[PDB]
Design a binder for this molecule. Structure first.
Ligand SMILES: O=P(O)(O)O[C@H]1[C@H](OP(=O)(O)O)[C@H](OP(=O)(O)O)[C@H](OP(=O)(O)O)[C@@H](OP(=O)(O)O)[C@H]1OP(=O)(O)O
Ligand SMILES: O=P(O)(O)O[C@H]1[C@H](OP(=O)(O)O)[C@H](OP(=O)(O)O)[C@H](OP(=O)(O)O)[C@@H](OP(=O)(O)O)[C@H]1OP(=O)(O)O
Ligand SMILES: [Zn+2]
Ligand SMILES: [Zn+2]
Lengths: 355, 384
RNA sequence: GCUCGCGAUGCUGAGGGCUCUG
RNA sequence: CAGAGCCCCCAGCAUCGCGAGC
């Protein structure tokens, strides 16, 4: 209960954890334009909240530097990187369940009636972003009392343009996408049921009408979702002491951290790789490694989708047929509302193996 | 009035004088300025025939946060920019005047044109005053009073010469356009990308091609040009001639009536003095017929109380719609139909849009950069 | 004459603090 | 709430020198 107290706690917890990871904000990698994070709650408590993930970044990869081997991060906007960090947590929580019977009590996952795994009662995830996400949620005049267009991130800069190959969808559109197909992605949907954010908390440029349109209301025309998939309508809130616009140059790097990690990981938004040119623990390849390790531990009869001898990344995603159908329904709802066609990257980029 | 320097001195004197009348002989708190500008209309040979159309002050552009998706905010409060917008109100009033009755046709500056719609009566000219050199190419390389002992520009073949330049939010310095960076966005500017505004040197060059009336008025009237640009200080003839026209002498394939205008360029006999103190945050505007100046917070693009200027895009669109309803179809210079959306209505000025296109290509072909526009969302509004 | 890098001295819209004032 | 005076601080130009390329 009390939306504004939750909002404040989530905002305070994520900022607090960012401090600890940056020598109380004094490290050069505390330099950020947008801060994001995910907080998990367990029961209608107060302070039984855990920061799951902490991220920064405002920039995307140049085309020259795109990987056809899953070694490069395509999108380093804080909120996108915070989701990917949550995927690392969810793989860890599946290994916790699977590695020892006595650890099943400590995992957020339990066996589901319907097959594979689902969350335990009252396990919720909350998204913090220090500003409203790029795209439709940020197309207004904050000093003033055709909308819902899908938008793409512009090659160089930090903002978006409407649509009608090398192009990334806005954060406003990706969170709307997460409010249909879940936050967990295609590959995790093979082990676990759809997972939604209960709350989206903004640290600035909060606006109830614009954010609700961006996040779900523009696609309430959505049709015939498979079972467990809903149009999720999370709690939307700003925070009590909002953050001021700081006009200037925006940093070139993106920070990420997941609960359990000893240190932040610093990526170059331009290359999608860390400062020494190695692959992130968040890239397609690294998440596919986590997924493959869990696929090795889960008996065939316990999968929510059939998939034996997984090799190519793209094939393994196509096996999540509930998810691919809810994605189709999503792509249709935007078209029929007159809001544009989702830009998908050419699926040679996902044609790689762990060979 | 026929001698370049007398006209130049009269234009300066009239704008100073009018600004004085409006600020209780410079006593009032809104007399405080760093840069003054104005438009004077001559309707013939004698000083009697000189009328001040507009007066403005200001040195500042809007803060990114305060951009209005309804066109209720002034984006650029550089004096010379505000003085042109004040002229636009005069031109709308003068069109409504012609249309009012047959008596009034005689007292309008406009007559029906042989080629459709309206044009100026013979010998109606406009003259722009700025108390200093316009920011960008006319100013950046020598923003100080000229000195006899200083021998003009020693390095006129430098790449930096003639370049399109932007004012940059929170940054001093008028900065070239670069090819690596691209398109400004609404969402980018709100979260803190610095808002870029094209320099006044670049905007007056534009006016010497597409005219001063803008896209909307071009649907009713033929292109209007400044006959003179007069600087009350920091006059440097070689930088100003380059900035105002000579750098895009390469421009081609202009629509009919559009041309590369080469206005008289001049300083004055007794240069204006450096205005003392900190640059005020407000911009003043006045058009002939107004009872008083309007004061705008240039940081917000609105007045002290948050109300829109008589000069904001919404007020100009409102003026255009009112005239649009009194001009019969057969007097339109353009028959192209567009939705009553600010952006869309400007696209009915097909010839103006083609002249803008030629302008942009000429800056690019000359190696002087690509023009930087506001985010496309700015002008996506309607009346109410 | 231009371009690039280095050095030097200068030039030209923000943020912060102190003081006074309305 | 606003304004001013003073200090502090934050991407282009000028001038001169050094090196190189054209
Ligand atoms: O975190 P993101 O940057 O938003 O990454 C997503 C994510 O890809 P990965 O999990 O492999 O990195 C989507 O994967 P799933 O929803 O299938 O789990 C995928 O979408 P599809 O593979 O379903 O097509 C793709 O998006 P897209 O192909 O639509 O461009 C991509 O987004 P980016 O390409 O923008 O990184
Ligand atoms: O130079 P300003 O007086 O500030 O105004 C101009 C003017 O816009 P408005 O009359 O609506 O304010 C131009 O419009 P036109 O009259 O030439 O049609 C427009 O250019 P576009 O029409 O191409 O939209 C735009 O310039 P831009 O979009 O290049 O930024 C803008 O300049 P500002 O944005 O700086 O105010
Ligand atoms: Zn984003
Ligand atoms: Zn200017």
């Amino acid at each position: 209960h009390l939306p504004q107290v939750l909002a404040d706690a989530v905002s305070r917890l994520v900022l607090g954890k960012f401090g600890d990871l940056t020598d109380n904000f004094s490290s050069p990698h505390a330099r950020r334009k947008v801060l994001a994070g995910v907080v998990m709650t367990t029961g209608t408590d107060v302070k039984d909240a855990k920061v799951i993930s902490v991220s920064t970044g405002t920039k995307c990869i140049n085309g020259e530097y795109m990987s056809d081997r899953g070694l490069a991060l395509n999108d380093c906007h804080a909120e996108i990187i915070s989701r990917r960090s949550l995927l690392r947590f969810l793989y860890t929580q599946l290994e916790l369940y699977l590695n020892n019977k006595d650890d099943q009590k400590r995992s957020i996952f339990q066996k589901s009636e319907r097959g594979g795994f689902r969350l335990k009662e009252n396990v919720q995830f909350h998204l913090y972003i220090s500003t409203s996400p790029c795209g439709d949620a940020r197309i207004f005049s904050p000093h003033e009392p055709a909308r819902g267009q899908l938008r793409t991130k512009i090659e160089s800069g930090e903002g978006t343009i409407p649509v009608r190959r090398l192009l990334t969808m806005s954060c406003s559109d990706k969170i709307a996408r997460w409010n249909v197909v879940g936050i967990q992605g295609s590959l995790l949907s093979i082990f676990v049921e759809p997972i939604y954010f209960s709350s989206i908390i903004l640290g600035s440029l909060y606006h109830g009408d614009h954010l609700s349109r961006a996040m779900y209301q523009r696609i309430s025309n959505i049709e015939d979702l498979p079972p467990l998939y809903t149009l999720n309508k999370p709690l939307l809130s700003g925070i009590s002491n909002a953050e001021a616009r700081q006009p200037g140059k925006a940093p070139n790097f993106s920070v990420n951290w997941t609960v359990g990690d000893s240190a932040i990981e610093v990526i170059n938004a331009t290359t999608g790789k860390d400062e020494l040119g190695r692959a992130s623990r968040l890239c397609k390849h690294a998440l596919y490694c986590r997924w493959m390790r869990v696929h090795g531990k889960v008996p065939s009869h316990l999968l929510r989708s059939k998939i034996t001898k997984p090799n190519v990344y793209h094939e393994s995603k196509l096996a999540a047929k509930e998810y691919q159908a809810a994605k189709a329904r999503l792509f249709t709802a935007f078209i029929k509302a007159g809001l544009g066609a989702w830009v998908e990257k050419p699926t040679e980029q996902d044609q790689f193996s762990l060979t």
